Amino acid sequence: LLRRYLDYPVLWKILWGLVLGAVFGLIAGHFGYAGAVKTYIKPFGDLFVRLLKMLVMPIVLASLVVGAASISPARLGRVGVKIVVYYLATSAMAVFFGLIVGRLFNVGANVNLGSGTGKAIEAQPPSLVQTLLNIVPTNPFASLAKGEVLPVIFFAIILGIAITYLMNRNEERVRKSAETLLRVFDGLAEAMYLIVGGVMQYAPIGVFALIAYVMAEQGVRVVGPLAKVVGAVYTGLFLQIVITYFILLKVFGIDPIKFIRKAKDAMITAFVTRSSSGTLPVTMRVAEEEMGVDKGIFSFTLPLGATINMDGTALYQGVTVLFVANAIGHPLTLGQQLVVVLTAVLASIGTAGVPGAGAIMLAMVLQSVGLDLTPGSPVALAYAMILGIDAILDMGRTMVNVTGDLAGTVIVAKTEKELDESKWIS
Amino acid sequence: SLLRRYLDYPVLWKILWGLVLGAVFGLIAGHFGYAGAVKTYIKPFGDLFVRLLKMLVMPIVLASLVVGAASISPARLGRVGVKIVVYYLATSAMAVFFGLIVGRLFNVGANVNLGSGTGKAIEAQPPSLVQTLLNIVPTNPFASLAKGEVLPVIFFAIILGIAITYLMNRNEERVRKSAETLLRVFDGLAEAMYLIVGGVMQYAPIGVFALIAYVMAEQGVRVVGPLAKVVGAVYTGLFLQIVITYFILLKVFGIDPIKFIRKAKDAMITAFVTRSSSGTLPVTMRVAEEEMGVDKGIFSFTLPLGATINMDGTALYQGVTVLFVANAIGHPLTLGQQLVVVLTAVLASIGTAGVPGAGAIMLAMVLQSVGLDLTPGSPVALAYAMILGIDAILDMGRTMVNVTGDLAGTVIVAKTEKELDESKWIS
Amino acid sequence: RYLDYPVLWKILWGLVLGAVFGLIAGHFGYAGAVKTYIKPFGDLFVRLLKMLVMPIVLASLVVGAASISPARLGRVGVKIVVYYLATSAMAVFFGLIVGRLFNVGANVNLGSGTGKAIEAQPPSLVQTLLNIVPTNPFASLAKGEVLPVIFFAIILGIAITYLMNRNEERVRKSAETLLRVFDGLAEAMYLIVGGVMQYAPIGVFALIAYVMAEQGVRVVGPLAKVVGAVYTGLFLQIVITYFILLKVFGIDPIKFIRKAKDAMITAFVTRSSSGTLPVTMRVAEEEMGVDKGIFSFTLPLGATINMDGTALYQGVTVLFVANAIGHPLTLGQQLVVVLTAVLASIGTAGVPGAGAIMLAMVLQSVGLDLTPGSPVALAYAMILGIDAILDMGRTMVNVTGDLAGTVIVAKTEKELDESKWIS
Ligand SMILES: N[C@H](C(=O)O)[C@H](OCc1ccccc1)C(=O)O
Ligand SMILES: N[C@H](C(=O)O)[C@H](OCc1ccccc1)C(=O)O
């Protein structure tokens, strides 16, 4: 009778896992029991996170090669530039919403910071041209064996274009060899999609465990000013999803409610996994088999959007800037806010592919608007206070990042006349 | 007697000859005072052999494991399939466990002590067993290939093989063709690795000679006492394996074990005399057909699958030899990496070759998974050279229990399915 | 547009424009502007060229060694190693000759200071001969190591060609699909190289512009004779040694150079022989006519162990720092220089930064040690100032030697397709 578990449709099976995990974590971590949760429950969550991370590199390499090798380079270039301008616009609007909400909700009214060696991170912004040079891999195998997503994107696209140029050639040997290499990569991509199907069949347990641990450990650090911060962040995220993405899908024809009902599979995996590059397998599978997007559009726009299009992250940064500026007692004016917007939009590009860049971008936005992040200063104390409930903030903004990647893929597909209209209508 | 003739002598006996010649050469050149004269003019060949052996460890556990897992996957396992595969895996696990038990009991490799210290960076932090299990799933399979990890890539290869079979069972044409081609690529890689591991095993005599010569010249340690102890321990472990494992597994599934022994006598003797698990496949097929009583289907499907994935003798030999290496180089194994040895030996038993070097390579893989660097010069390489320089005796001993387990599993799967007639068993 | 031109001699007019504009930007004091707004293109080109070295080497070598008999492969290897040793020795000989000619390091006031002094860590020859065997081939691919990949690809290609001659069927149809995978990979890599050569003019221009900007102002006085000595040594090395070897083995010198102007100009600015491997392999196969059996096993090996212009620079630098600290050498010390230079070319292949270690060996072999504070570590810190403009040409010659030796071994092995060589 175990099969009923494995034979349960996973659409309304994740949400139940997530909600029951939230309830269990809140009723456990409120009675002083987070230790048993972290020792006996959270291993399942970490196993699920690692099971998802295991697929991100083979899936991106294989699917991207098979896609780019099935698309004319002109279409690939126009899709690239369209999705890039879309990503910049969405990050800008997300920081705009973040600042608007932070000013509205009056986040950080009286933070009442203490005294101590606050958390500080040396900004050290990598150069922009240096980052655009790091997109080219000095070694493709070393860029595979390091978890970097952008260099392998570049190499996979180049290899796909070369492979289709080969399959356009005239000599039988080279054409057959190109076809065989493409069949290898196709089999690899499809095997990875099947493994993703299996992992998502297992996913309710991992989602339960993860959300239970997260809402149990930090289910009590949400009080007073931290409660204000988490409320303002989640309100900004819900307003980004319900205003910007809804209007952008409604202006290009895509029905918003349908897109959300279909992306609820890769949304509740991001909201819990707390990594946009982690849930890349789930979102690529959902954009291929629940949206009807050509494998040349989503396979290019989802992995890139997993390292560039950070909307929830940009919103969290734009609102924690207001929080820290109100904590130190020197509020932000109406021009420094535009500087924050520009600097966040530019930092999302300047940290494209850098691992652990969740704090470098915040250091950039704080340095460019005068708030030096030198340690021991009150600004470091407020940033450490935020890093406190970060684990409960890092949940929603990952969901917003992945929903943004998906909405960008869907829009670029629909505007390029390669979106399956059959599985959209009812 | 040129080197062209040297390539026709059997590999395992060449290796034992090389180890004995290395013993006598080290003794002579150490008593005459030529230690520094063999650490530079003889040792490089041993280091070359170690670097040539450690190379095939990663491309084998990636390709061979994929093909293996793609030959036993649940996408093509009916009732008999799963019921024999769970048996093969459980018996391999209990065989590695018996290897560990009898190795710790006999205290294998305690009078060799060729290690520098009793621990400097190892045996200083406890690896959480839960966190050690969550290291099976790799956060990046290519990073676990390029970093030289054996268990994460084994898990990823198993998962890829199962996925590829589930693809090959798909009604579509493009994806089925793609899965066929990917499996053919991995099959070709595994086969090329088997060719290269045959060449390396042909080179292995000179490497074992150089390593043992350097050891016995520099250090006065002898490799006869502990090695006879390891031989005795592996054979006692095989005896305990047969008796305990198969007699309980039979008496629990309604079978008289004495008749099982008196009937599999033929296959046991011929496997012990041929030193090959597959070279005795016709004989064990005949014994299971006309002397045991199995029907054509079961003894035609399980016996080849058992010739491929079901290996207890090699599993027990690893469970004893990794413990010998641990107790030899100085710092023994914990309780959180004995299970890593068990898991790696088991999950590696599902992808095998049959080539002579199917124990040496599947022991380098274990020595890398549990974590014991085979770095050239490190005492792990020297103790592994010792334990590989006697592959003949252990091989001839364990090839018997391999096919013994094959027959026991075939008869078990038959008797839990009512397809073996009683006219051959009941008197 | 822009792609409508034969790039055979568009790289030349990229290079000349780059050199003149770099000299101008250096004369006018603008090195910052060029390094900040021009060198990005050069670095993009260098990375586009390095991106292919490992896949092109692996695939090309496997496909080649799976279509050649191991005995023919061994004969080819012996021939090419003999050639590499001979050319390294003769290059050091030419370096010493032209150094004594120009009186390198005749007089120069060093000036006491810190001075560059790298710790000479000389590995034994046996260690750098065992390091050719990879402990883990994927770890050798993921580390930029070319020689372990050479070994693994050679033995894998031989194993594949041994499988494709087996009476079995499931393995005969499975070791010919892996071979076609590697064939497709090598072909796609040659296509990507042919697509990068379109951008190669901008890259060459930017690279040589930056290099002639930041160094074109330092080549004055006693530091200006050493560059003349190195470049006259390189020109003499080519025009004498390579032309004599070619005209002896039948190959045409002039046609050879006119055929190599694609992988000499893109190595004279890439400043890395192991990085310009894709372009030189493509140019060998598609302009010289060598089959994938010779130019895939000899070209990366020559990019790793053959250093002709580098050894000429070692000879010139040895004579420089010897005549500059007031210590002239002798004929015997010069023979020592030559032999230690060849043995350092061999017994250093593989370790990163191998360009400052073999120099330490060829210096310690004459009595001048790289000790910090000593006059040698102050007389060599000065010759290191112009190392870019002194390394460009010697990388050019390090690659021209690879091409010449590949063509020599080919024409000796009848592999050289004689239809691509006469018009
Ligand atoms: N939550 C996301 C994630 O963990 O992937 C996000 O990741 C940080 C990041 C990493 C790389 C590039 C941009 C942003 C974040 O933490 O803000
Ligand atoms: N960079 C030059 C070249 O590759 O030709 C050469 O560098 C030596 C070198 C560099 C890297 C690896 C091996 C040898 C030199 O400076 O003379």
Coordinates of N, CA, C and O in Angstrom, one line a residue, chain B residues 87 246-263 292 294 407-418 420-422 425-426:
Chain B
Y87 N 18.8 -10.3 -3.3 CA 19.6 -11.3 -2.7 C 21.1 -11.1 -3.0 O 21.9 -11.2 -2.0
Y246 N 25.0 -18.9 4.0 CA 24.1 -19.8 3.1 C 23.4 -20.8 3.9 O 22.2 -21.1 3.5
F247 N 23.9 -21.4 5.0 CA 23.2 -22.3 5.7 C 22.0 -21.7 6.4 O 20.9 -22.3 6.5
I248 N 22.1 -20.5 7.0 CA 20.9 -19.9 7.6 C 20.0 -19.4 6.5 O 18.7 -19.6 6.6
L249 N 20.5 -18.9 5.4 CA 19.6 -18.5 4.3 C 18.9 -19.6 3.7 O 17.8 -19.4 3.1
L250 N 19.4 -20.8 3.8 CA 18.7 -22.0 3.3 C 17.7 -22.5 4.3 O 16.5 -22.7 4.0
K251 N 18.2 -22.7 5.5 CA 17.3 -23.2 6.6 C 16.1 -22.3 6.9 O 15.1 -22.7 7.5
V252 N 16.2 -21.0 6.4 CA 15.1 -20.1 6.6 C 14.1 -20.2 5.4 O 12.9 -19.9 5.5
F253 N 14.6 -20.7 4.2 CA 13.7 -20.9 3.1 C 13.4 -22.3 2.8 O 13.4 -22.8 1.6
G254 N 13.3 -23.2 3.8 CA 12.9 -24.5 3.7 C 13.7 -25.4 2.7 O 13.2 -25.9 1.7
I255 N 15.0 -25.6 3.1 CA 15.9 -26.3 2.2 C 16.9 -27.0 3.1 O 17.4 -26.4 4.1
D256 N 17.2 -28.3 2.8 CA 18.2 -29.0 3.5 C 19.6 -28.6 3.0 O 19.9 -28.9 1.8
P257 N 20.4 -27.9 3.8 CA 21.7 -27.4 3.3 C 22.7 -28.5 2.9 O 23.5 -28.3 2.0
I258 N 22.7 -29.6 3.6 CA 23.7 -30.7 3.3 C 23.5 -31.2 1.9 O 24.5 -31.5 1.2
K259 N 22.2 -31.3 1.4 CA 22.0 -31.7 0.0 C 22.5 -30.6 -0.9 O 23.0 -30.9 -2.0
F260 N 22.3 -29.4 -0.5 CA 22.8 -28.3 -1.3 C 24.3 -28.4 -1.5 O 24.8 -28.2 -2.6
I261 N 25.1 -28.7 -0.4 CA 26.5 -28.8 -0.5 C 26.9 -30.0 -1.4 O 27.7 -29.9 -2.3
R262 N 26.3 -31.2 -1.1 CA 26.6 -32.4 -1.9 C 26.2 -32.3 -3.4 O 26.8 -33.0 -4.2
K263 N 25.3 -31.3 -3.7 CA 25.0 -31.2 -5.1 C 25.8 -30.1 -5.8 O 26.3 -30.3 -6.9
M292 N 20.3 -29.7 -9.3 CA 19.5 -28.9 -8.3 C 18.0 -29.0 -8.5 O 17.2 -29.4 -7.6
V294 N 16.2 -26.6 -10.8 CA 15.6 -25.3 -11.2 C 15.1 -25.4 -12.6 O 15.5 -26.3 -13.4
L407 N 24.7 -20.1 -7.1 CA 23.8 -21.3 -7.0 C 22.8 -21.1 -5.9 O 21.7 -21.5 -6.0
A408 N 23.3 -20.7 -4.7 CA 22.4 -20.6 -3.5 C 21.3 -19.6 -3.8 O 20.1 -19.8 -3.5
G409 N 21.6 -18.4 -4.5 CA 20.6 -17.5 -4.8 C 19.6 -18.0 -5.9 O 18.4 -17.7 -5.8
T410 N 20.1 -18.7 -6.9 CA 19.2 -19.3 -7.9 C 18.3 -20.2 -7.2 O 17.1 -20.1 -7.4
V411 N 18.8 -21.1 -6.4 CA 17.9 -22.1 -5.7 C 16.9 -21.4 -4.8 O 15.8 -21.8 -4.7
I412 N 17.4 -20.3 -4.1 CA 16.5 -19.6 -3.2 C 15.3 -19.0 -4.0 O 14.2 -19.1 -3.6
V413 N 15.7 -18.2 -5.0 CA 14.7 -17.5 -5.8 C 13.7 -18.5 -6.4 O 12.5 -18.3 -6.6
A414 N 14.2 -19.7 -6.8 CA 13.3 -20.8 -7.4 C 12.4 -21.3 -6.3 O 11.2 -21.4 -6.5
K415 N 12.9 -21.6 -5.1 CA 12.1 -22.2 -4.1 C 11.1 -21.3 -3.4 O 10.2 -21.7 -2.8
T416 N 11.4 -20.0 -3.5 CA 10.4 -19.0 -3.1 C 9.4 -18.7 -4.2 O 8.6 -17.7 -4.1
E417 N 9.4 -19.4 -5.3 CA 8.5 -19.2 -6.4 C 7.9 -20.5 -7.0 O 7.1 -20.5 -7.9
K418 N 8.3 -21.7 -6.4 CA 7.7 -23.0 -6.8 C 8.0 -23.3 -8.3 O 7.1 -23.4 -9.1
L420 N 11.2 -25.3 -8.8 CA 12.2 -26.3 -8.7 C 11.6 -27.6 -8.1 O 11.0 -27.6 -7.0
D421 N 11.6 -28.6 -8.9 CA 10.9 -29.8 -8.6 C 11.5 -30.5 -7.4 O 12.7 -30.4 -7.1
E422 N 10.7 -31.2 -6.6 CA 11.1 -31.9 -5.4 C 11.7 -33.2 -5.7 O 12.4 -33.8 -4.8
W425 N 15.4 -33.3 -4.8 CA 15.8 -33.0 -3.4 C 15.3 -34.0 -2.4 O 16.2 -34.6 -1.7
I426 N 14.0 -34.2 -2.3 CA 13.5 -35.1 -1.4 C 13.9 -36.6 -1.7 O 13.9 -37.0 -2.8

